Amino acid sequence: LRQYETMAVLRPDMTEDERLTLTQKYEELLVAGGAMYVEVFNRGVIPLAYSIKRKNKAGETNNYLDGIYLLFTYFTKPESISPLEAALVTDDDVIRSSSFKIRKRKY
Amino acid sequence: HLYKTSTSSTRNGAVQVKSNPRNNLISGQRRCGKGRNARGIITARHRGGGHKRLYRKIDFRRNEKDIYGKIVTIEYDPNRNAYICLIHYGDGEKRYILHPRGAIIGDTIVSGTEVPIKMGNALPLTDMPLGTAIHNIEITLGRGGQLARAAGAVAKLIAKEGKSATLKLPSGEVRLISKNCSATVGQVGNVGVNQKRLGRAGSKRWLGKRPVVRGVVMNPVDHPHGGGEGRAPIGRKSPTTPWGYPALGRRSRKRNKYSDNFIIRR
Amino acid sequence: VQVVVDDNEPEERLLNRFRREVMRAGVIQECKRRRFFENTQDVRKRKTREAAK
Amino acid sequence: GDRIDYRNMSLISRFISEQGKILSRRVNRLTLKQQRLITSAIKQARILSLLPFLNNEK
Amino acid sequence: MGKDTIADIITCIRNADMNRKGTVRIVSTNITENIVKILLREGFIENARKHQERNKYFLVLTLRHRRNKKGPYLNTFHLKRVSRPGLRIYSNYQRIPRILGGMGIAILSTSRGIMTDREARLEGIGGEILCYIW
Amino acid sequence: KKNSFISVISDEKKEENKGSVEFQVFCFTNKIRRLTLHLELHKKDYSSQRGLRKTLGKRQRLLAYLLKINGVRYKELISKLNIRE
RNA sequence: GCGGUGGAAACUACCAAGCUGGAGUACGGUAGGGGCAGAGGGAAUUUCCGGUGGAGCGGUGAAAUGCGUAGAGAUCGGAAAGAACACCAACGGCGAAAGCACUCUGCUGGGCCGACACUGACACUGAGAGACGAAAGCUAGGGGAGCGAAUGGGAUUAGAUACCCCAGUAGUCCUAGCCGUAAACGAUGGAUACUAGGCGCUGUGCGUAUCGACCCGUGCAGUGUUGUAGCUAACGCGUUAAGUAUCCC
C-alpha cells in the first residue's frame, strides 16, 4: 500500500458537520480493507479567484463566491485510487478531486 | 477508418460481392410492416418496394427505474443500423435498449434517478452536470422518439440551463424541450457500421427500396417537365407537382410554433 | 493583472507609471501580432545570447 | 525553507509579486534547482485559489 | 574499447612529447613491454618501470627532451603504425624497410623474438613490422 | 519491482549473485513479456518500442554467449523460460 | 608466384584454464516538456439569448468593401464550443532523430551519481533488412473558436489575376491507416584512447558540530572564450575540435 493525499476542492454547499461525515464515510471505504488514516487539516472558508461552477444546468441568478479547502492525508491500496475520486464527484458537491502521491511522512 | 475493427472491403473480381444471411431468433417480435408503400387506395409517394423486411421489436421509453443491468450479447436489427444488444437487468427483465459503445461484457447499465452517469440506461436530464453526451431525447416526459438512430445520435447540451429547456440537436440546430425528460445517455451507435458502401445496387439496394432516381425522361405529363430532343428544362421549376426544391421554406405556425432558437441557415 | 491605487489622499496624480514597467505595451506587442512558431525559439533567443556576455 | 509545501499562503505570497505572474530569476534569489519545483507548487496552489492566476492588485 | 593496445601507446607518447610531459602511464601487456625495451637500448627514452594505480597495473614511461630553445627539440619526431588491425603487413629478409637511410629504425616482431632494423638483418630473419621510430 | 528482482536471483541454480548469464536473461525476459502486454493496451505508444528492441538486442548477445561456453546450461534455460529454439 | 618437406614462435588466428580496467546487471537515490492513455483547471477569442444606452463602429500610409437606427460597437449577466495553454522559461532540461513544456492520476523508457556486490569481454561498427518520420498532402468517420491555400470584394499601381483591407473553404484539431520528404544543419556518422587554460548547470563526498548566502574537491550533460599548441585555402575549430591516432560503415 502507498501513502496518498487527496484534496477534495469542496463546493460551498456543504457545511462543517457535512464535511466531517464525509471523513467518516472515507473510513468505511479504506480502513475496511487493510488500510489506515493520519489526520485532517481544515483551512477554512476562503474566497475564490474565479467563481467555478457558478451554475451548470441550473438557474440564471446563482453565483458561488466562497469555498472551503481540506486535504485528507491517508494510506490505501493502489487499485482503490480511481473509484475513490469517482465516488466523490458523483455527489452534487465537490468541484475537483485530485489525488497526490506523498513521499514525506506527516505526523 | 480511424478506429479498430476496420470495415471489410470486397476487392475487385466481378463488380460486387453479395451475400446470403443465416441466423436465428428468439421471440421479441410481432410481425412488422409487410405491405410495402401503400395506403389501401393509393400508393402515394413512389419509390419503395422489394421484400426482405419484417422483424419489428420494441422497448424505447423504458419505465423501469433504479435497476441494475448486464448486457449479455450484441444483436442487429433491420432498417436501423446501430445494434441493439439484449442486455439483462439484475432482476431479469428481457429487453433490448440501444447499444451504447463500450459494452458487450455486460458492464453496469441502470436507469432511474440518481444513477452512475456513463452509458447505462434511462436517466432524467434533471440530474446531469453538463451533458456533453446524451443519446435519445424525448419531446415529452413519456415517448422515446427523436434521434433513435443510435449510430451518430448526438445532441450536446448547455451545461446548466433554467426554464427547463436546453438540448443541442445536430443538423437540427438548437431548440427548447422539457427538462423533465430522460435518455439512455449513450449517444453512440457505431459510425463505421454505416461508413461502408452499398456497392453497385442490385443485391444491396433494390432489396430495400425501389429506384431512387427518376430523371427528366421527357413526357410533360409523366412529370411537370420534359420533352425536347434530349436536354431538359432544368431550373425552370421541374419538381414533381408544385414542390420547389430551391429551398423556399416550410413548416409555418403561430401558436404551437417551433420553439427552436439560433437555427443558422448559412 | 490590474493596477494599484490602494493609496488614499484626494491626490490627482496618475501613478500609471508603476505598472508600465512589468505589464506595459510589452505583453501586448509580444502578442496581438502573428507567432513565428520556430523563429520565436531561434531569432528571439539568438539576440539575447550575444547581449548576455 | 519549504519548497514542496503549497499550503503555506503567508510564505508563497512573498514569492509571487503584486501580479499573478510567477517571479523572475533576478528577484527572490533562487537557482534553477529551487525553481520549477516551486513553480509546480504555485501552479497547484492556484487551482485551489489561494494564489490567483491573474491577481488583481486591488 | 581498445581495438589495438599496440596502437594507443604510439598515440600516448606522440601527444605527450608535443606538449612536453615528464611521465606517461600506459597499459600493462608483455608485447608492449618488449617495444619499450628496444626503445631504451637504442636510446629513444630514459627508462621504464612497473606501477599500480587502483588494482590496475600500469607502466611508467619517462621521456627525454633536448636543450632549451624557443621550442625544445623532441626525441621522436614522428611515430606511426604499419601493421594496423585489418591491414596486417608481413615482410621477408629483403623487404625490410630502410628508415631515413640508417638514422631511424623500425621495430619488428620476428620468429626469434623482438628485433629492430639492424638486428633482423644480421640474423637473417623477418616478420610482422609493428612501427617505425625516428 | 523489488519482488521481481529478488525472485530471479534465488530460483535458478548458479553459486554467484546477479552477475550470471542465467539470472540476467530471465530478468530481461520478465521485462519483455510485461512490456509486450503493455503494448496490447497502450498500442498508441511509440517511445516504449525502442526500449523493447534494446532489451531484445541485449538478450540475443547473452544467449549467443552461453552457446559458446557449454550446451548443458543453455538447453536447461531456454526450455524453462519458454522462448523459441 | 604456387606446392611440398624440415624448423622458428614473437605477433595474428585456433583450443583449454583464468584475470580485470571494457561492457552488462543488481542495491539505494537524483533531475528531466521522454512517451502513451484518461481526467480536470484558468485567461482570452467567437457565437447564441437578455438588460442598459447611443450613432457610430471596424480598418488603413490614406480610404473603401463590411457591420449600424428590423439599433452594431462598447458595457453587464448567463449559456454553448474549440484550440492553445501567459508568467515561471533560462545563454534551461529531456530524447537516437524528428521532437516534446498548465496541473493530476495510471502504465512505461533512457541517462547519471554513490559505498559497493556479481558476471566476465558477453565488445565496436555494421551493406541488405526491420522500425521510428516537422510540416504539407491523401483515405474513412468525427470536430471545427481562432487562424488561414483556394476563392469573392475594396485599395494600391502604368498593369498586380501580389504586398495591404474586409470575408472566407480545404486545412490546421481527434481516432485509424497511408505518404516517407525538409538549410530532417552543429549543412562536422558512430565508438575508444590521448593533448595548454580562464568563467556559467545536475549528483555526491568533505569543510570549528555545515555556524553562513556558502568553502574545498570529485563525476554526467551543456555555452561562450582575446582561447594556446596544432590543424585549415581562409573564415574559423580548438580536449562536446574540422588537434594527434585506432575500429567500421
mmCIF file of all heavy atoms in Angstrom, chain G residues 6-19:
data_model
loop_
_atom_site.group_PDB
_atom_site.id
_atom_site.type_symbol
_atom_site.label_atom_id
_atom_site.label_comp_id
_atom_site.label_asym_id
_atom_site.label_seq_id
_atom_site.Cartn_x
_atom_site.Cartn_y
_atom_site.Cartn_z
ATOM 1 P P G G 6 58.200 -33.067 -42.462
ATOM 2 O OP1 G G 6 58.141 -34.382 -41.775
ATOM 3 O OP2 G G 6 57.076 -32.107 -42.306
ATOM 4 O "O5'" G G 6 59.545 -32.334 -42.023
ATOM 5 C "C5'" G G 6 60.788 -33.034 -42.006
ATOM 6 C "C4'" G G 6 61.920 -32.084 -41.697
ATOM 7 O "O4'" G G 6 62.047 -31.115 -42.773
ATOM 8 C "C3'" G G 6 61.741 -31.232 -40.451
ATOM 9 O "O3'" G G 6 62.124 -31.931 -39.268
ATOM 10 C "C2'" G G 6 62.652 -30.044 -40.738
ATOM 11 O "O2'" G G 6 64.015 -30.308 -40.470
ATOM 12 C "C1'" G G 6 62.440 -29.858 -42.242
ATOM 13 N N9 G G 6 61.413 -28.869 -42.566
ATOM 14 C C8 G G 6 60.127 -29.113 -42.989
ATOM 15 N N7 G G 6 59.442 -28.022 -43.201
ATOM 16 C C5 G G 6 60.325 -26.995 -42.900
ATOM 17 C C6 G G 6 60.146 -25.587 -42.943
ATOM 18 O O6 G G 6 59.139 -24.946 -43.266
ATOM 19 N N1 G G 6 61.300 -24.914 -42.554
ATOM 20 C C2 G G 6 62.475 -25.514 -42.175
ATOM 21 N N2 G G 6 63.477 -24.691 -41.835
ATOM 22 N N3 G G 6 62.656 -26.825 -42.132
ATOM 23 C C4 G G 6 61.547 -27.499 -42.505
ATOM 24 P P G G 7 61.644 -31.385 -37.833
ATOM 25 O OP1 G G 7 62.634 -31.841 -36.824
ATOM 26 O OP2 G G 7 60.208 -31.718 -37.656
ATOM 27 O "O5'" G G 7 61.785 -29.806 -37.989
ATOM 28 C "C5'" G G 7 61.593 -28.923 -36.894
ATOM 29 C "C4'" G G 7 62.439 -27.688 -37.087
ATOM 30 O "O4'" G G 7 62.280 -27.207 -38.445
ATOM 31 C "C3'" G G 7 62.092 -26.498 -36.209
ATOM 32 O "O3'" G G 7 62.747 -26.599 -34.949
ATOM 33 C "C2'" G G 7 62.620 -25.325 -37.029
ATOM 34 O "O2'" G G 7 64.010 -25.118 -36.871
ATOM 35 C "C1'" G G 7 62.332 -25.792 -38.460
ATOM 36 N N9 G G 7 61.083 -25.287 -39.027
ATOM 37 C C8 G G 7 59.967 -26.018 -39.365
ATOM 38 N N7 G G 7 59.009 -25.289 -39.868
ATOM 39 C C5 G G 7 59.519 -23.998 -39.860
ATOM 40 C C6 G G 7 58.937 -22.777 -40.288
ATOM 41 O O6 G G 7 57.818 -22.588 -40.780
ATOM 42 N N1 G G 7 59.800 -21.704 -40.096
ATOM 43 C C2 G G 7 61.063 -21.791 -39.563
ATOM 44 N N2 G G 7 61.740 -20.638 -39.455
ATOM 45 N N3 G G 7 61.619 -22.921 -39.163
ATOM 46 C C4 G G 7 60.796 -23.978 -39.340
ATOM 47 P P A G 8 62.081 -25.930 -33.649
ATOM 48 O OP1 A G 8 63.017 -26.144 -32.515
ATOM 49 O OP2 A G 8 60.679 -26.406 -33.540
ATOM 50 O "O5'" A G 8 62.054 -24.374 -33.992
ATOM 51 C "C5'" A G 8 63.248 -23.595 -33.973
ATOM 52 C "C4'" A G 8 62.924 -22.138 -34.208
ATOM 53 O "O4'" A G 8 62.438 -21.963 -35.564
ATOM 54 C "C3'" A G 8 61.824 -21.570 -33.326
ATOM 55 O "O3'" A G 8 62.359 -21.137 -32.078
ATOM 56 C "C2'" A G 8 61.297 -20.411 -34.164
ATOM 57 O "O2'" A G 8 62.085 -19.244 -34.050
ATOM 58 C "C1'" A G 8 61.419 -20.977 -35.582
ATOM 59 N N9 A G 8 60.194 -21.594 -36.097
ATOM 60 C C8 A G 8 59.817 -22.914 -36.022
ATOM 61 N N7 A G 8 58.668 -23.170 -36.601
ATOM 62 C C5 A G 8 58.258 -21.936 -37.085
ATOM 63 C C6 A G 8 57.118 -21.534 -37.805
ATOM 64 N N6 A G 8 56.149 -22.371 -38.184
ATOM 65 N N1 A G 8 57.008 -20.229 -38.130
ATOM 66 C C2 A G 8 57.986 -19.392 -37.759
ATOM 67 N N3 A G 8 59.105 -19.650 -37.089
ATOM 68 C C4 A G 8 59.183 -20.955 -36.777
ATOM 69 P P A G 9 61.548 -21.423 -30.720
ATOM 70 O OP1 A G 9 62.396 -20.955 -29.593
ATOM 71 O OP2 A G 9 61.070 -22.829 -30.740
ATOM 72 O "O5'" A G 9 60.281 -20.464 -30.819
ATOM 73 C "C5'" A G 9 60.436 -19.048 -30.882
ATOM 74 C "C4'" A G 9 59.109 -18.390 -31.176
ATOM 75 O "O4'" A G 9 58.651 -18.796 -32.486
ATOM 76 C "C3'" A G 9 57.977 -18.742 -30.223
ATOM 77 O "O3'" A G 9 58.073 -17.873 -29.086
ATOM 78 C "C2'" A G 9 56.726 -18.558 -31.085
ATOM 79 O "O2'" A G 9 56.194 -17.251 -31.071
ATOM 80 C "C1'" A G 9 57.241 -18.908 -32.486
ATOM 81 N N9 A G 9 56.889 -20.244 -32.965
ATOM 82 C C8 A G 9 57.313 -21.463 -32.492
ATOM 83 N N7 A G 9 56.832 -22.484 -33.157
ATOM 84 C C5 A G 9 56.034 -21.901 -34.132
ATOM 85 C C6 A G 9 55.249 -22.445 -35.162
ATOM 86 N N6 A G 9 55.137 -23.755 -35.396
ATOM 87 N N1 A G 9 54.572 -21.586 -35.956
ATOM 88 C C2 A G 9 54.689 -20.273 -35.726
ATOM 89 N N3 A G 9 55.396 -19.641 -34.795
ATOM 90 C C4 A G 9 56.054 -20.522 -34.021
ATOM 91 P P A G 10 56.781 -17.547 -28.180
ATOM 92 O OP1 A G 10 57.246 -17.565 -26.768
ATOM 93 O OP2 A G 10 55.630 -18.399 -28.576
ATOM 94 O "O5'" A G 10 56.442 -16.036 -28.566
ATOM 95 C "C5'" A G 10 57.133 -14.949 -27.947
ATOM 96 C "C4'" A G 10 57.004 -13.686 -28.775
ATOM 97 O "O4'" A G 10 57.824 -13.771 -29.969
ATOM 98 C "C3'" A G 10 55.617 -13.357 -29.301
ATOM 99 O "O3'" A G 10 54.831 -12.725 -28.298
ATOM 100 C "C2'" A G 10 55.928 -12.413 -30.459
ATOM 101 O "O2'" A G 10 56.156 -11.082 -30.037
ATOM 102 C "C1'" A G 10 57.227 -13.010 -31.009
ATOM 103 N N9 A G 10 57.050 -13.873 -32.181
ATOM 104 C C8 A G 10 57.364 -15.204 -32.291
ATOM 105 N N7 A G 10 57.092 -15.719 -33.464
ATOM 106 C C5 A G 10 56.568 -14.655 -34.182
ATOM 107 C C6 A G 10 56.092 -14.548 -35.500
ATOM 108 N N6 A G 10 56.061 -15.567 -36.362
ATOM 109 N N1 A G 10 55.642 -13.342 -35.909
ATOM 110 C C2 A G 10 55.672 -12.322 -35.043
ATOM 111 N N3 A G 10 56.092 -12.298 -33.781
ATOM 112 C C4 A G 10 56.534 -13.510 -33.406
ATOM 113 P P C G 11 53.234 -12.911 -28.303
ATOM 114 O OP1 C G 11 52.696 -12.139 -27.153
ATOM 115 O OP2 C G 11 52.928 -14.360 -28.420
ATOM 116 O "O5'" C G 11 52.772 -12.194 -29.648
ATOM 117 C "C5'" C G 11 52.902 -10.782 -29.802
ATOM 118 C "C4'" C G 11 52.478 -10.358 -31.188
ATOM 119 O "O4'" C G 11 53.403 -10.898 -32.166
ATOM 120 C "C3'" C G 11 51.110 -10.852 -31.630
ATOM 121 O "O3'" C G 11 50.085 -9.980 -31.167
ATOM 122 C "C2'" C G 11 51.238 -10.844 -33.149
ATOM 123 O "O2'" C G 11 51.055 -9.561 -33.715
ATOM 124 C "C1'" C G 11 52.692 -11.288 -33.331
ATOM 125 N N1 C G 11 52.855 -12.746 -33.514
ATOM 126 C C2 C G 11 52.644 -13.300 -34.787
ATOM 127 O O2 C G 11 52.311 -12.556 -35.725
ATOM 128 N N3 C G 11 52.809 -14.632 -34.961
ATOM 129 C C4 C G 11 53.165 -15.401 -33.929
ATOM 130 N N4 C G 11 53.323 -16.709 -34.150
ATOM 131 C C5 C G 11 53.377 -14.867 -32.626
ATOM 132 C C6 C G 11 53.212 -13.548 -32.465
ATOM 133 P P U G 12 48.646 -10.580 -30.781
ATOM 134 O OP1 U G 12 47.832 -9.459 -30.244
ATOM 135 O OP2 U G 12 48.849 -11.799 -29.955
ATOM 136 O "O5'" U G 12 48.031 -11.024 -32.183
ATOM 137 C "C5'" U G 12 47.536 -10.055 -33.104
ATOM 138 C "C4'" U G 12 46.989 -10.734 -34.338
ATOM 139 O "O4'" U G 12 48.076 -11.350 -35.080
ATOM 140 C "C3'" U G 12 46.020 -11.878 -34.088
ATOM 141 O "O3'" U G 12 44.700 -11.406 -33.846
ATOM 142 C "C2'" U G 12 46.122 -12.669 -35.386
ATOM 143 O "O2'" U G 12 45.360 -12.112 -36.439
ATOM 144 C "C1'" U G 12 47.615 -12.545 -35.697
ATOM 145 N N1 U G 12 48.404 -13.678 -35.186
ATOM 146 C C2 U G 12 48.495 -14.813 -35.981
ATOM 147 O O2 U G 12 47.967 -14.905 -37.079
ATOM 148 N N3 U G 12 49.231 -15.840 -35.441
ATOM 149 C C4 U G 12 49.870 -15.852 -34.220
ATOM 150 O O4 U G 12 50.477 -16.864 -33.866
ATOM 151 C C5 U G 12 49.736 -14.647 -33.462
ATOM 152 C C6 U G 12 49.026 -13.628 -33.957
ATOM 153 P P A G 13 43.722 -12.246 -32.884
ATOM 154 O OP1 A G 13 42.412 -11.546 -32.863
ATOM 155 O OP2 A G 13 44.434 -12.511 -31.608
ATOM 156 O "O5'" A G 13 43.538 -13.634 -33.648
ATOM 157 C "C5'" A G 13 42.844 -13.697 -34.892
ATOM 158 C "C4'" A G 13 42.862 -15.107 -35.438
ATOM 159 O "O4'" A G 13 44.221 -15.484 -35.784
ATOM 160 C "C3'" A G 13 42.412 -16.200 -34.482
ATOM 161 O "O3'" A G 13 40.993 -16.302 -34.432
ATOM 162 C "C2'" A G 13 43.054 -17.438 -35.094
ATOM 163 O "O2'" A G 13 42.330 -17.958 -36.193
ATOM 164 C "C1'" A G 13 44.396 -16.879 -35.573
ATOM 165 N N9 A G 13 45.479 -17.076 -34.606
ATOM 166 C C8 A G 13 46.125 -16.131 -33.845
ATOM 167 N N7 A G 13 47.054 -16.627 -33.064
ATOM 168 C C5 A G 13 47.020 -17.989 -33.326
ATOM 169 C C6 A G 13 47.761 -19.070 -32.817
ATOM 170 N N6 A G 13 48.723 -18.942 -31.900
ATOM 171 N N1 A G 13 47.477 -20.303 -33.288
ATOM 172 C C2 A G 13 46.513 -20.432 -34.208
ATOM 173 N N3 A G 13 45.748 -19.494 -34.763
ATOM 174 C C4 A G 13 46.055 -18.280 -34.274
ATOM 175 P P C G 14 40.289 -16.946 -33.138
ATOM 176 O OP1 C G 14 38.821 -16.853 -33.342
ATOM 177 O OP2 C G 14 40.899 -16.347 -31.922
ATOM 178 O "O5'" C G 14 40.709 -18.482 -33.200
ATOM 179 C "C5'" C G 14 40.203 -19.337 -34.223
ATOM 180 C "C4'" C G 14 40.611 -20.770 -33.967
ATOM 181 O "O4'" C G 14 42.046 -20.912 -34.124
ATOM 182 C "C3'" C G 14 40.341 -21.300 -32.569
ATOM 183 O "O3'" C G 14 38.988 -21.719 -32.422
ATOM 184 C "C2'" C G 14 41.315 -22.469 -32.477
ATOM 185 O "O2'" C G 14 40.838 -23.642 -33.109
ATOM 186 C "C1'" C G 14 42.522 -21.921 -33.244
ATOM 187 N N1 C G 14 43.560 -21.342 -32.365
ATOM 188 C C2 C G 14 44.531 -22.195 -31.811
ATOM 189 O O2 C G 14 44.497 -23.408 -32.078
ATOM 190 N N3 C G 14 45.481 -21.675 -31.001
ATOM 191 C C4 C G 14 45.489 -20.368 -30.735
ATOM 192 N N4 C G 14 46.445 -19.899 -29.929
ATOM 193 C C5 C G 14 44.518 -19.479 -31.283
ATOM 194 C C6 C G 14 43.582 -20.004 -32.084
ATOM 195 P P C G 15 38.288 -21.653 -30.977
ATOM 196 O OP1 C G 15 36.888 -22.122 -31.142
ATOM 197 O OP2 C G 15 38.546 -20.312 -30.389
ATOM 198 O "O5'" C G 15 39.083 -22.733 -30.119
ATOM 199 C "C5'" C G 15 38.949 -24.127 -30.391
ATOM 200 C "C4'" C G 15 39.794 -24.938 -29.436
ATOM 201 O "O4'" C G 15 41.202 -24.686 -29.691
ATOM 202 C "C3'" C G 15 39.624 -24.616 -27.960
ATOM 203 O "O3'" C G 15 38.490 -25.278 -27.414
ATOM 204 C "C2'" C G 15 40.932 -25.129 -27.368
ATOM 205 O "O2'" C G 15 40.934 -26.526 -27.154
ATOM 206 C "C1'" C G 15 41.928 -24.769 -28.474
ATOM 207 N N1 C G 15 42.625 -23.487 -28.243
ATOM 208 C C2 C G 15 43.788 -23.480 -27.452
ATOM 209 O O2 C G 15 44.203 -24.549 -26.973
ATOM 210 N N3 C G 15 44.429 -22.309 -27.232
ATOM 211 C C4 C G 15 43.955 -21.179 -27.762
ATOM 212 N N4 C G 15 44.620 -20.047 -27.515
ATOM 213 C C5 C G 15 42.780 -21.157 -28.568
ATOM 214 C C6 C G 15 42.153 -22.321 -28.782
ATOM 215 P P A G 16 37.758 -24.667 -26.119
ATOM 216 O OP1 A G 16 36.551 -25.493 -25.861
ATOM 217 O OP2 A G 16 37.615 -23.199 -26.306
ATOM 218 O "O5'" A G 16 38.800 -24.918 -24.940
ATOM 219 C "C5'" A G 16 39.045 -26.236 -24.449
ATOM 220 C "C4'" A G 16 40.021 -26.195 -23.296
ATOM 221 O "O4'" A G 16 41.329 -25.787 -23.773
ATOM 222 C "C3'" A G 16 39.699 -25.203 -22.191
ATOM 223 O "O3'" A G 16 38.750 -25.745 -21.277
ATOM 224 C "C2'" A G 16 41.064 -24.986 -21.546
ATOM 225 O "O2'" A G 16 41.419 -26.008 -20.636
ATOM 226 C "C1'" A G 16 41.989 -25.035 -22.767
ATOM 227 N N9 A G 16 42.319 -23.716 -23.309
ATOM 228 C C8 A G 16 41.723 -23.054 -24.357
ATOM 229 N N7 A G 16 42.248 -21.880 -24.609
ATOM 230 C C5 A G 16 43.257 -21.757 -23.665
ATOM 231 C C6 A G 16 44.187 -20.735 -23.403
ATOM 232 N N6 A G 16 44.254 -19.597 -24.098
ATOM 233 N N1 A G 16 45.058 -20.924 -22.387
ATOM 234 C C2 A G 16 44.991 -22.065 -21.691
ATOM 235 N N3 A G 16 44.165 -23.098 -21.841
ATOM 236 C C4 A G 16 43.313 -22.879 -22.857
ATOM 237 P P A G 17 37.812 -24.756 -20.424
ATOM 238 O OP1 A G 17 36.781 -25.594 -19.759
ATOM 239 O OP2 A G 17 37.389 -23.630 -21.296
ATOM 240 O "O5'" A G 17 38.787 -24.180 -19.304
ATOM 241 C "C5'" A G 17 39.327 -25.032 -18.295
ATOM 242 C "C4'" A G 17 40.366 -24.293 -17.484
ATOM 243 O "O4'" A G 17 41.488 -23.945 -18.339
ATOM 244 C "C3'" A G 17 39.922 -22.963 -16.898
ATOM 245 O "O3'" A G 17 39.218 -23.131 -15.671
ATOM 246 C "C2'" A G 17 41.250 -22.243 -16.697
ATOM 247 O "O2'" A G 17 41.927 -22.640 -15.520
ATOM 248 C "C1'" A G 17 42.033 -22.700 -17.930
ATOM 249 N N9 A G 17 41.945 -21.758 -19.048
ATOM 250 C C8 A G 17 41.100 -21.799 -20.132
ATOM 251 N N7 A G 17 41.260 -20.800 -20.966
ATOM 252 C C5 A G 17 42.278 -20.050 -20.397
ATOM 253 C C6 A G 17 42.914 -18.861 -20.796
ATOM 254 N N6 A G 17 42.603 -18.193 -21.909
ATOM 255 N N1 A G 17 43.893 -18.375 -20.003
ATOM 256 C C2 A G 17 44.205 -19.045 -18.887
ATOM 257 N N3 A G 17 43.682 -20.170 -18.405
ATOM 258 C C4 A G 17 42.712 -20.628 -19.217
ATOM 259 P P G G 18 38.166 -22.008 -15.199
ATOM 260 O OP1 G G 18 38.231 -21.938 -13.716
ATOM 261 O OP2 G G 18 36.866 -22.274 -15.865
ATOM 262 O "O5'" G G 18 38.770 -20.661 -15.799
ATOM 263 C "C5'" G G 18 38.596 -19.408 -15.145
ATOM 264 C "C4'" G G 18 39.942 -18.819 -14.797
ATOM 265 O "O4'" G G 18 40.821 -18.906 -15.948
ATOM 266 C "C3'" G G 18 39.943 -17.346 -14.422
ATOM 267 O "O3'" G G 18 39.630 -17.170 -13.044
ATOM 268 C "C2'" G G 18 41.376 -16.934 -14.737
ATOM 269 O "O2'" G G 18 42.290 -17.272 -13.712
ATOM 270 C "C1'" G G 18 41.670 -17.772 -15.985
ATOM 271 N N9 G G 18 41.448 -17.067 -17.246
ATOM 272 C C8 G G 18 40.553 -17.396 -18.238
ATOM 273 N N7 G G 18 40.592 -16.580 -19.256
ATOM 274 C C5 G G 18 41.569 -15.654 -18.917
ATOM 275 C C6 G G 18 42.053 -14.530 -19.632
ATOM 276 O O6 G G 18 41.704 -14.114 -20.743
ATOM 277 N N1 G G 18 43.045 -13.863 -18.921
ATOM 278 C C2 G G 18 43.513 -14.228 -17.684
ATOM 279 N N2 G G 18 44.474 -13.452 -17.161
ATOM 280 N N3 G G 18 43.073 -15.275 -17.008
ATOM 281 C C4 G G 18 42.107 -15.939 -17.680
ATOM 282 P P C G 19 38.800 -15.875 -12.575
ATOM 283 O OP1 C G 19 38.632 -15.971 -11.102
ATOM 284 O OP2 C G 19 37.600 -15.747 -13.442
ATOM 285 O "O5'" C G 19 39.777 -14.656 -12.891
ATOM 286 C "C5'" C G 19 40.949 -14.431 -12.110
ATOM 287 C "C4'" C G 19 41.659 -13.179 -12.573
ATOM 288 O "O4'" C G 19 42.146 -13.373 -13.926
ATOM 289 C "C3'" C G 19 40.803 -11.925 -12.653
ATOM 290 O "O3'" C G 19 40.712 -11.286 -11.383
ATOM 291 C "C2'" C G 19 41.566 -11.079 -13.666
ATOM 292 O "O2'" C G 19 42.663 -10.388 -13.101
ATOM 293 C "C1'" C G 19 42.072 -12.147 -14.639
ATOM 294 N N1 C G 19 41.210 -12.337 -15.824
ATOM 295 C C2 C G 19 41.393 -11.500 -16.938
ATOM 296 O O2 C G 19 42.270 -10.621 -16.899
ATOM 297 N N3 C G 19 40.612 -11.672 -18.028
ATOM 298 C C4 C G 19 39.678 -12.626 -18.037
ATOM 299 N N4 C G 19 38.936 -12.760 -19.136
ATOM 300 C C5 C G 19 39.466 -13.485 -16.920
ATOM 301 C C6 C G 19 40.245 -13.308 -15.845
#
